[PDB]
Ligand binder design. Structure first.
Ligand SMILES: *[C@@H]1O[C@H](CO[C@@H]2O[C@@H](C)[C@@H](O)[C@@H](O)[C@@H]2O)[C@@H](O[C@@H]2O[C@H](CO)[C@@H](O[C@@H]3O[C@H](CO)[C@@H](O)[C@H](O)[C@@H]3O)[C@H](O)[C@H]2NC(C)=O)[C@H](O)[C@H]1NC(C)=O
Ligand SMILES: *[C@@H]1O[C@H](CO)[C@@H](O[C@@H]2O[C@H](CO)[C@@H](O[C@@H]3O[C@H](CO)[C@@H](O)[C@H](O)[C@@H]3O)[C@H](O)[C@H]2NC(C)=O)[C@H](O)[C@H]1NC(C)=O
Ligand SMILES: *[C@@H]1O[C@H](CO)[C@@H](O[C@@H]2O[C@H](CO)[C@@H](O[C@@H]3O[C@H](CO)[C@@H](O)[C@H](O)[C@@H]3O)[C@H](O)[C@H]2NC(C)=O)[C@H](O)[C@H]1NC(C)=O
Ligand SMILES: *[C@@H]1O[C@H](CO)[C@@H](O[C@@H]2O[C@H](CO)[C@@H](O)[C@H](O)[C@H]2NC(C)=O)[C@H](O)[C@H]1NC(C)=O
Ligand SMILES: *[C@@H]1O[C@H](CO)[C@@H](O)[C@H](O)[C@H]1NC(C)=O
Ligand SMILES: *[C@@H]1O[C@H](CO)[C@@H](O)[C@H](O)[C@H]1NC(C)=O
Ligand SMILES: *[C@@H]1O[C@H](CO)[C@@H](O)[C@H](O)[C@H]1NC(C)=O
Ligand SMILES: [Ca+2]
Ligand SMILES: [Ca+2]
Ligand SMILES: [Ca+2]
Lengths: 167, 316, 316, 167, 316, 167
């Protein structure tokens, strides 16, 4: 019944962006990973700080809404204003498309990093199932699952048992 | 036993655009294009002058609607559609450049130019400029021949700018309804007004002639200006049809000027204005008004562009 | 046994540029900068007027080249290099502004101004404006003294704009070759033309003197214009040297105007034009003409910029 | 004689962008992967939709090719036009260099995703040879190869045999 | 036994900005915004004219400061603040357009216009234009009535441009201090100057009157100009108050013009100039002067933007 | 005591950007990888060539610092100039932020490529320790270590010994 990020995201994960879901004799459970979550949020916050900027440049009226300026100068002003508007509209569309692509790829890349880290903690004691989970080839109770989550799992302790079970 | 790595998802995803896809759903997103207007001029923290019936250029010449603003001071100047620069019909020449100079001025301080006259009348007045009966522009003098039809002596008047800032100098040319009326006021013959500084010389000839009534009057007074440098002199030479300045104007400091049709609100703060109100926003773009001024988000054509603030949304 | 993962490749790769490399080969690519021109004006779906020998301003005054266009109607107006505004030599004052007003006008509808005259001749004519012999601008009248050297009576003529749109009003001032000719035509003495509306007044004095022969003539007629507001009146006062309008012009709607040297083609559709033709393209950029007009790709300096549409090409 | 994407691309793969090439007793064969191919084409099509846009803004003449405008206003117009051209030339060059870099990385990333997927299907039954191939440690006939391609290969069926062969 | 893969790092990292972070440290980085100025005009490889006290428009009319530059040649023209176009006071009408024409001209080659005169004096001179005593603009002639108060004959003078390039034609109108002086110089009565080509027609009436003494003088001479096409003729008709050209000017080729307050240095090469010196740089941006001209990095508001030339710096 | 790129960079690696650090009976040593190093430098050089460009477009004065132009046209010119400056200031900030992001990601990606290559050379004879190193399960003397660095290590030669040591 339980699966990882390769299939889909988890609607029930409400305490974080990334997390761990486990199944053992004591049941199923899910906990957020605080570090990866915060690393992603900080990168998005960094974007927002850069993009939610105000120009400090003050512009004034060169035109007149109540009493129309002379036509020749008016047409130059309007051509120039419309050309500037084309430039900004193009830059705004591109900026958002480009940033959104990067935001998406960056969020996936934080997922892959966490996954790759857990893989390496587990060493020869587990195999990938292809959905974003590890089948762990030894009994791993709630305290063992916690040691995987907080990065203190010691693969040497279970290696003998796990390697034997893998054959 | 097993452990899975996963990421969050929501049922309420938001669609955004990327380089390769339109409408990919993300967990969260935010607007980048401001559409929300406040329909007031948010003037908190700024000395604000609402000119009302006074046209901005009138502050310099002084028709009756502008009597309270002859020496105004402000950070923020608001012009209104009901504003008129004039009482006797006419207009300013090169009017928009002058408006642009005044909008950023901080207001104006007036200084007497010291002209006095002999051999002429100085009391020209009109029912179009109403105070306690017929009157005239507060800052100008309608110079006339001593008596009807009499010759208007050739005259020269000079003013030096003693201050450290450029002086705004304004004068008028009166275009009578007919060569008959121009004769009655200033004596017959060709009328000429010359105006010279060290960096400016121009000549003006009135052009009398029939035209439509404005306020019941067919005559016109048109206004001209220049910027007189520190330590420079302006000299006026003329033999009639000349509306003389009584005072020069000096700009006070710095301001911003806008044109608007909504009320002032001294309780909200803001720095981006257009005719319909105040754009209060930190977004980088806006789709409200391409002629907004002050310190503004940049105008774009699109109504909306969503920036993703979360990962791809991959529900089950 | 074994299984490999791989991707395609071709022997005919195409070079493109990336952020880190010039000339990396990709499996496929496509042009982003338009170079292909159609050397015609693709006018399908648009009422098109090709002015030919008629200059755009001539549609308003009516020299003989313009007789077919006095009230033209169009979505697309084409000016040609052989176009002349004039028959008797001279030119329009503030001419380019007026061209720009007429290029977007949709054309013009003319209305009689109603002027009639007594005590003068109305039939001034010249061999420069050829119809069935000597003639003149179709929309104007060359007013003369009743007989050679006779005095030209002081006159006033007024026209009111009854419509809901601004009227384009045009008149002329005739500058004779010599004070002798000016006297023959309009009687000796100083000549003056004054023109007034509620927002405009100006004086004109003809200035006789020798100018180089243009079409065998050394005189000049210069044309002036103004926009007369709904319900306003224009009043002309004059005692000679005045080329009077017979009709006012009203703008019809909306159009686009171009300048071109190639033929019209009513069988192809297009929206981006320049003097050498039509740019039919969906590419976002073009390197054909920086002054192209209509709805156009944006002009860039580079002739070509290839957009990769495939992966890196890695042959064996 | 057979190798994968780490060495080079395949000129003989004409039915798709990505594919499988196998070798067993019944010989060699190559088939396109429809899904990865289509995923890449759809992302390129997405780019083209965004970049093959028309402006809807109409511009008019402010200049005159037959009768030159007044020189002061003409020089302002031309300075403004040449500034706008510099902006657009720079945006066009950048747009294409940035998009081509992304196009290239995106195509390689689809190749890595397919490869990683097959690796995870194969689990303990195969090893990487370093050219983009898997040495499969059991007999894998044409039907078995097809089950790898269409994602129904069941590693459990061959694991006993394969693990023994890997020692 | 073991083998580890790693990458370099340094203790002295450099901070840069990315899409997601301000101040991330990288192993190496480089400036993109130029701040380094050279306080000289780097003129190597270019024929350079430093106009000094000669104002650029004075090269055409020839007051005494400009006597060495009447027919100058250059690739690079430098104007200086002390430069004056004038000796007798006045100014050029449409002056900035003409400056812009001359800055790019390559310099000017002068040609005699061939006017000769009878029945008048030609020797008008003034103590404002000092050479060996009182003198005048080298390229012009102050035409006077034969004797004080005498009548000035009505005159016409024409010049044709035989060359293949447009001729720059300049003339002057003299506005006397009073109608008395204007009578002394040119005889009483109304004064008129007309100027015509096939594409230009304008009239000028002097306007006498007092203005501030500039160099002890209260008169003014204003200069007007036109471009005369190959094969076209210009004709001047006048009865006084006319300052006649003796020569026309043809533009030589191509140049660039700057305004500067620093010295020339023929030993350094450069192409980007501003008033304070030369920007020698290959960087794509600059924060030195937004009005820099030539071939320049683009002006930006930021003083520094660092481009990473190395990886993220991850020390222990 | 010895660790790889997942922990941090090496201040002692002064001959290159990327490298190998080993530990065996003959001691510890470090050597730069020339190919990955050069591949990274070339991509940075490529960026520089594109960004260190000169415009060839000449601009002229349209303004006057000694004798101020007429106020109407002066204000149009200044408005236009300030708008253009806003555009270039925005482009410059963006260009650098986008290029620095790409430079950083590209440099990390060259590290991962080298690491992945060595993993595939070592096949079943080593395991990942999670710091960017491989524990090699056979004796690997200085010649052997060199063969890993120059891509001629033959896993078959040691496989028997290594697989036995891994159990
Ligand atoms: C997708 O979903 C969530 C949850 O949406 C919320 O849940 C229910 C109450 C619904 O009926 C929704 O109407 C409601 O928004 C979004 O996060 C939520 O945002 C809201 C609205 O901005 C937060 O409300 C706050 O409430 C306090 C006091 O009442 C105010 O002071 C704040 O100004 C603020 O508006 C709300 O706290 C938050 N919900 C939770 C549980 O944290 C989420 O943002 C959304 N997607 C997008 C794109 O916005
Ligand atoms: C989904 O994304 C939106 C928009 O980014 C999130 O709202 C935003 O939250 C940020 C960070 O908390 C807000 O910053 C705050 O504003 C000011 C200025 O920085 C300051 O007073 C606060 O202390 C704080 O930093 C930001 O204003 C706010 N933006 C908007 C438009 O509301 C929202 O939190 C997200 N929702 C979820 C469920 O993640
Ligand atoms: C850290 O940063 C920079 C990378 O920008 C290194 O300096 C740069 O080195 C290159 C080539 O090695 C220089 O190119 C030179 O340009 C001239 C210019 O005409 C050319 O003629 C030469 O032949 C040469 O190729 C480049 O100028 C230089 N950049 C700067 C701003 O000076 C620097 O060495 C790096 N440090 C380390 C330790 O790698
Ligand atoms: C190489 O790329 C081009 C350009 O994108 C492909 O041609 C386009 O195909 C689309 C739809 O698939 C059409 O709507 C366009 O008309 C084509 N564009 C152009 C500019 O011709 C082309 O098919 C590709 N070639 C191959 C073999 O894939
Ligand atoms: C310039 O643009 C405005 C809208 O901003 C419009 O109302 C005005 O007519 C335009 N001016 C001309 C001269 O076409
Ligand atoms: C403006 O640009 C064109 C080329 O587009 C040139 O022919 C024209 O002369 C320019 N105007 C001036 C005054 O240099
Ligand atoms: C135009 O900008 C310059 C600064 O470059 C300034 O000195 C000048 O006064 C501005 N012009 C006006 C009319 O404000
Ligand atoms: Ca005062
Ligand atoms: Ca009609
Ligand atoms: Ca010569």
């Amino acid at each position: 019944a339980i699966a990882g990020f390769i299939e889909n995201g988890w609607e029930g994960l409400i305490d974080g962006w990334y997390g761990f879901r486990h199944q053992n004799a004591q049941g199923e459970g899910t906990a957020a990973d605080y570090k990866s979550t915060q690393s992603a949020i900080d990168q998005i916050t960094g974007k927002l700080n850069r993009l939610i900027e105000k120009t400090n440049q003050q512009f004034e009226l060169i035109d007149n809404e109540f009493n129309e300026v002379e036509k020749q100068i008016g047409n130059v002003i309007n051509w120039t204003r419309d050309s500037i508007t084309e430039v900004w509209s193009y830059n705004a569309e591109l900026l958002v498309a480009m940033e959104n692509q990067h935001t998406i790829d960056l969020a996936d890349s934080e997922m892959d990093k966490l996954y790759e880290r857990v893989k390496r903690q587990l060493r020869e004691n587990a195999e990938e199932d292809g959905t974003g989970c590890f089948e762990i080839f030894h009994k791993c109770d709630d305290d063992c699952m916690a040691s995987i989550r907080n990065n203190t799992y010691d693969h040497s302790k279970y290696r003998e048992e796990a390697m034997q079970n893998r054959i | 036993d097993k452990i899975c790595l996963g990421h969050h998802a929501v049922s309420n995803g938001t669609k955004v655009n990327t380089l390769t896809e339109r409408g990919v759903e993300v967990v969260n997103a935010t607007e980048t294009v401001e559409r929300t207007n406040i329909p007031r001029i948010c003037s908190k923290g700024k000395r604000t002058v609402d000119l009302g019936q006074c046209g901005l250029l009138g502050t310099i010449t002084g028709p009756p609607q502008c009597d309270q603003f002859l020496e105004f001071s402000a950070d923020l100047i608001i012009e209104r559609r009901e504003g008129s620069d004039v009482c006797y019909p006419g207009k300013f020449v090169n009017e928009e450049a002058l408006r642009q100079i005044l909008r950023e001025s901080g207001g104006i301080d007036k200084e007497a130019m010291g002209f006095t006259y002999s051999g002429i009348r100085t009391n020209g007045a009109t029912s179009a400029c109403r105070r306690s009966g017929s009157s005239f522009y507060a800052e100008m003098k309608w110079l006339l021949s001593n008596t009807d039809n009499a010759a208007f002596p050739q005259m020269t008047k000079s003013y030096k700018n003693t201050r450290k800032s450029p002086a705004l100098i304004v004068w008028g040319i009166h275009h009578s309804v007919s060569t008959a009326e121009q004769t009655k006021l200033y004596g017959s013959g060709n009328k000429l007004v010359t105006v010279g500084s060290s960096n400016y010389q121009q000549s003006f000839v009135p052009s009398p002639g029939a035209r439509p009534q404005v306020n019941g009057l067919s005559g016109r007074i048109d206004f001209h200006w220049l910027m007189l440098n520190p330590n420079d002199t302006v000299t006026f030479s003329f033999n009639g049809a000349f509306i003389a300045p009584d005072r020069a104007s000096f700009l006070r400091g710095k301001s911003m000027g806008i044109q608007s049709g909504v009320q002032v609100d001294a309780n909200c703060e803001g720095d981006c204005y257009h005719s319909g109100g105040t754009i209060i926003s930190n977004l980088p773009f806006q789709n409200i008004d391409s002629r907004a001024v002050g310190k503004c988000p940049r105008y774009v054509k699109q109504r909306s562009l969503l920036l993703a603030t979360g990962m791809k949304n991959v529900p089950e």
